[PDB]
């Protein structure tokens, strides 16, 4: 049995102009390959194919390898690869929120497409029909929680935030939190996390909504209270401290917040509270006050009777129809892969994800516990971030903050199989997600006009093959005129976004487009095509 093969994984997606695919042979001196139906071309062991070369992004490449054994049996193996294109997207930030790190982008987004939430009455009932994708104020990714960066921590329950949605009405501020669990796909041998034991309500784990009502106030996370005898004490964080120290860390804030909704994954924490940073420290920052906190905890776990009109309901389920994240086994992660387009990004729904794998929290915070009304939300706006923990320190946030992963691959002091992110000091520096209205000093970074350009067939087609040059416009103003070029010469200049090129002779060609929109903005792309 003779056959051609590649060590390159089948259905690899690549963001580069090409993927240098290594060809090998078993029990044959020679073989042949066909790329996008090209005329068969001889290959010896070690030869390579520039899969995707000359092609437009978001196209499939088919590679067929042909071998004949001594027996005369003819063998064919067909691989498929995906060349991907991702447009840049508009971002914005305001210096007045105290942020020192730009919002994370790529698969992450803060207020994507300027979504600031909607005026809508939500039912806190675990039914997701109240929500839709247009209400997302913070987009995260799946499988970027700290355990993924350890050699073998996939046995540990995930703390994997996916998306945060918001609404408001006359009475309440509403949130939907989606959490993902991709353990079933990436690491099924780690049964504990690929089971009902992954449910976030298995135990009482702190969760937070960090809010900015007055954008000028900076609360570092430090807390102040008085004992029964009136003596003043301080803690570096509202929660997780004993004798004025945080032995297992916590989450602090550079980005401006003044309100902290401290609740729990089980809704069994009777001490759940809305803290206000109402006391100025010597450094001009504000401290969360134990003495003025608004109780929002249950009287009885069984009754789920939260105080002061706070509502929370959790369930299995998924609202998003796509779950984007990196599909890789334990030991095949890279420092910062969550911010890198070269990573093995998938929609996990294409890899066997089920709605029932995910978890949802619906939340109502009464406006009268935040000292605001609907007019304030729609005129001034507020800022929000969701924080997940596994007891003390942050693990994942929406919007996502790089302090969640800066020590992800270091060992947990009590159990070195798991992540130091469970016990370290995090500090938030990215913008909060805006609700209702943008800060007045907002600067918009508009995504410039760009094109996705290339051939409908892989480089290496035969002379006389009709090749369709294709162009796609992103962030264009009005109608676009496409000037298609071969070897620097204009072959077509018109409104039409495709052009048939039939090369008569062999050679290396440059193919290009120059696109001009209705305001004279220019986008260009030049690629190589070999005949």
Ligand X SMILES: OC[C@H]1O[C@H](O[C@H]2[C@H](O)[C@@H](O)[C@@H](O[C@H]3[C@H](O)[C@@H](O)[C@@H](O[C@H]4[C@H](O)[C@@H](O)[C@@H](O[C@H]5[C@H](O)[C@@H](O)[C@@H](O[C@H]6[C@H](O)[C@@H](O)[C@@H](O[C@H]7[C@H](O)[C@@H](O)[C@@H](O[C@H]8[C@H](O)[C@@H](O)[C@@H](O[C@H]9[C@H](O)[C@@H](O)[C@@H](O[C@H]%10[C@H](O)[C@@H](O)[C@@H](O[C@H]%11[C@H](O)[C@@H](O)[C@@H](O[C@H]%12[C@H](O)[C@@H](O)[C@@H](O)O[C@@H]%12CO)O[C@@H]%11CO)O[C@@H]%10CO)O[C@@H]9CO)O[C@@H]8CO)O[C@@H]7CO)O[C@@H]6CO)O[C@@H]5CO)O[C@@H]4CO)O[C@@H]3CO)O[C@@H]2CO)[C@H](O)[C@@H](O)[C@@H]1O
Ligand Y SMILES: OC[C@H]1O[C@H](O[C@H]2[C@H](O)[C@@H](O)[C@@H](O[C@H]3[C@H](O)[C@@H](O)[C@@H](O[C@H]4[C@H](O)[C@@H](O)[C@@H](O[C@H]5[C@H](O)[C@@H](O)[C@@H](O[C@H]6[C@H](O)[C@@H](O)[C@@H](O[C@H]7[C@H](O)[C@@H](O)[C@@H](O[C@H]8[C@H](O)[C@@H](O)[C@@H](O[C@H]9[C@H](O)[C@@H](O)[C@@H](O)O[C@@H]9CO)O[C@@H]8CO)O[C@@H]7CO)O[C@@H]6CO)O[C@@H]5CO)O[C@@H]4CO)O[C@@H]3CO)O[C@@H]2CO)[C@H](O)[C@@H](O)[C@@H]1O
Provide the binding-site residues for ligand X, judged by CB under 6 A: 155-156, 192, 204, 206, 239-240, 262, 269-271, 273, 290, 412, 414-415, 418
Judged by DSSP in three states, 91 sits in strand
> Which class for 69: exposed (0-12), middle (13-18), buried (19 or more C-beta within 10 A)?
middle
Rounded alpha-carbon distances, angstroms, from residue 117 to 166, 176, 378, 396: 5, 11, 10, 21
Binding site for Na ion (CB under 5 A): 123, 125, 127, 130
Q: With contact defined as beta carbons under 8 Å apart, do 370 and 259 qualify?
A: yes
Judged by DSSP in three states, 428 sits in strand
Of the candidates 435, 408, 482, which has an alpha carbon nearest to the alpha carbon of residue 97? 435
The reply on whether position 361 binds ligand Y by CB under 6 A is: no
The minimum distance between CB 526 and ligand Y, in angstroms, equals 48
The minimum distance between CB 318 and ligand X, in angstroms, equals 23
Residue 281 or 411 with smaller CB distance to ligand X: 411
Distance (Å, whole) CA 359 – CA 356: 8
Residue 130 or 421 with smaller CB distance to ligand Y: 421
Binding map of ligand Y across residues 194-233, x = CB under 6 A, - = no contact = ---------x-xx---------------------------
The reply on whether position 426 binds Ca ion by CB under 5 A is: yes
Q: With contact defined as beta carbons under 8 Å apart, do 385 and 391 qualify?
A: no
Q: State the binding partner of 269 from Ca ion, ligand X, ligand Y, none, CB within 5 to 8 A by kind.
A: ligand X
Query: Which member of 160, 248, 337, 401 binds ligand Y (CB under 6 A)?
Result: 248
The reply on whether position 147 binds ligand Y by CB under 6 A is: no
Q: Is the omega angle on the peptide bond into residue 365 within 30 degrees of 0, that is, cis?
A: no
Judged by DSSP in three states, 352 sits in coil
The minimum distance between CB 148 and ligand Y, in angstroms, equals 14
The minimum distance between CB 377 and Ca ion, in angstroms, equals 27
The minimum distance between CB 185 and Ca ion, in angstroms, equals 15
Span 131-160, contacts to Ca ion by CB under 5 A: 140, 144, 160
DSSP lists the bridge partners of residue 274 as: 261, 294
Q: State the binding partner of 259 from ligand X, ligand Y, Na ion, none, CB within 5 to 8 A by kind.
A: none
Residue 146 or 240 with smaller CB distance to ligand Y: 240
Distance (Å, whole) CA 445 – CA 424: 33
Q: With contact defined as beta carbons under 8 Å apart, do 198 and 181 qualify?
A: yes
DSSP characters for 242-292? BTTB-TT-EEEESS---EEEEEETTS--TT-EEEEEEEE-TTS-EEEEGGG
The minimum distance between CB 136 and Na ion, in angstroms, equals 15
Residue 160 or 472 with smaller CB distance to Ca ion: 160
Phi and psi torsions of 97, nearest 5°: -85, 0
Question: Which are the contacts of 255, defined by CB distance < 8 A and separation ≥ 6?
Answer: 97, 98, 99, 100, 212, 385, 428, 429, 430, 431, 432
The reply on whether position 263 binds ligand Y by CB under 6 A is: no
By CB under 6 A, the count of residues binding ligand Y is: 13
Q: State the binding partner of 130 from ligand Y, Ca ion, Na ion, none, CB within 5 to 8 A by kind.
A: Na ion
Q: State the binding partner of 424 from ligand X, ligand Y, Na ion, none, CB within 5 to 8 A by kind.
A: none
Span 386-405, contacts to ligand Y by CB under 6 A: 390-392
> Which class for 106: exposed (0-12), middle (13-18), buried (19 or more C-beta within 10 A)?
middle
Residue 196 or 321 with smaller CB distance to ligand X: 196
Q: State the binding partner of 337 from ligand Y, ligand X, Na ion, none, CB within 5 to 8 A by kind.
A: none
Q: With contact defined as beta carbons under 8 Å apart, do 108 and 267 qualify?
A: no
Q: State the binding partner of 396 from ligand Y, Na ion, Ca ion, none, CB within 5 to 8 A by kind.
A: Ca ion
The minimum distance between CB 289 and ligand X, in angstroms, equals 11
> Which residues of the shown chain bind Ca ion in the complex (CB under 5 A)?
140, 144, 160-161, 393-394, 396, 403, 406-407, 421, 424, 426
> Which residues of the shown chain bind ligand Y in the complex (CB under 6 A)?
152, 155, 189, 203, 205-206, 240, 248, 390-392, 415, 417
């Amino acid at each position: 049995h003779a056959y051609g093969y590649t060590l390159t994984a089948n259905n690899t997606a690549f963001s580069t102009e090409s993927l240098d695919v290594k060809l090998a042979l078993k029990n044959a001196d020679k073989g042949y390959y066909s790329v996008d139906g090209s005329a068969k071309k001889e290959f010896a062991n070690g030869d390579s194919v520039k899969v995707g070369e000359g092609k437009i992004g978001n196209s499939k490449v088919t590679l067929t390898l042909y071998a004949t054994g001594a027996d005369g049996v003819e063998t064919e193996q067909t691989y498929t690869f995906k060349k991907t294109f991702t447009a840049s997207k508009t971002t914005f930030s305001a210096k007045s929120d105290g942020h020192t790190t730009a919002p994370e982008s790529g698969y992450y987004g803060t207020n994507p497409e300027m979504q600031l939430g909607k005026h809508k009455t939500i039912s806190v009932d675990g039914d997701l029909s109240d929500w839709d994708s247009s209400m997302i104020i913070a987009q995260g990714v799946a499988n970027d929680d700290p355990r993924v960066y350890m050699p073998s921590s996939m046995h540990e329950q995930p703390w994997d935030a996916y998306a945060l949605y918001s609404a408001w009405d006359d009475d309440n501020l509403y949130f939907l939190l989606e959490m993902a669990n991709t353990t079933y796909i990436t690491s099924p041998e780690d049964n504990f996390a690929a089971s009902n034991e992954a449910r976030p309500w298995r135990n009482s784990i702190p969760m937070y909504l960090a809010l900015s009502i007055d954008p000028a106030k900076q609360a570092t996370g430090k807390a102040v209270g008085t004992n029964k005898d009136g003596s003043v004490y301080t803690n570096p964080f509202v929660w997780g401290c004993t004798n004025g120290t945080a032995k297992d860390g916590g989450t602090g804030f550079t980005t401006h917040i003044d309100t902290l909704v401290a609740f729990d994954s089980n809704n069994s924490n009777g001490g759940a509270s809305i803290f206000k940073a109402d006391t100025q420290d010597t450094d001009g920052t504000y401290m969360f006050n134990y003495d003025t906190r608004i109780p929002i905890g249950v009287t009885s776990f069984q009754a789920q009777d939260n105080k002061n009109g706070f509502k929370i309901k959790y369930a299995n389920g998924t609202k998003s129809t796509s779950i984007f994240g990196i599909n890789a086994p334990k030991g095949s992660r890279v420092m910062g892969d969550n911010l890198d387009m070269n990573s093995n990004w998938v929609d996990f729904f294409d890899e066997g994800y089920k709605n029932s794998y995910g978890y949802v929290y619906e939340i109502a915070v009464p406006l009268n516990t935040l000292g605001i009304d609907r007019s304030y939300i729609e005129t001034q706006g507020i800022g929000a971030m969701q924080i997940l923990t596994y007891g003390t320190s942050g693990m994942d946030t929406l919007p996502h903050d790089p302090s969640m992963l800066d020590q992800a691959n270091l060992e947990y002091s009590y159990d070195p199989s798991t992540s130091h992110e469970k016990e370290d000091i995090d500090n938030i520096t990215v913008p909060l997600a805006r609700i209702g209205a943008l800060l007045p000093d907002t600067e918009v970074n508009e995504a410039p006009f760009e094109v996705n350009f290339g051939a409908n067939l892989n480089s290496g087609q035969s002379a006389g093959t009709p090749i369709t040059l294709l162009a796609e416009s992103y962030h264009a103003t009005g109608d676009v005129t496409y000037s298609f070029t071969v070897n620097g010469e204009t072959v077509q200049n018109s409104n039409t976004d495709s052009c048939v090129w039939t090369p008569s002779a062999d050679g290396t060609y440059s193919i290009g487009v120059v696109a001009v929109d209705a305001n004279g903005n220019k986008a260009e792309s030049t690629k190589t095509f070999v005949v």
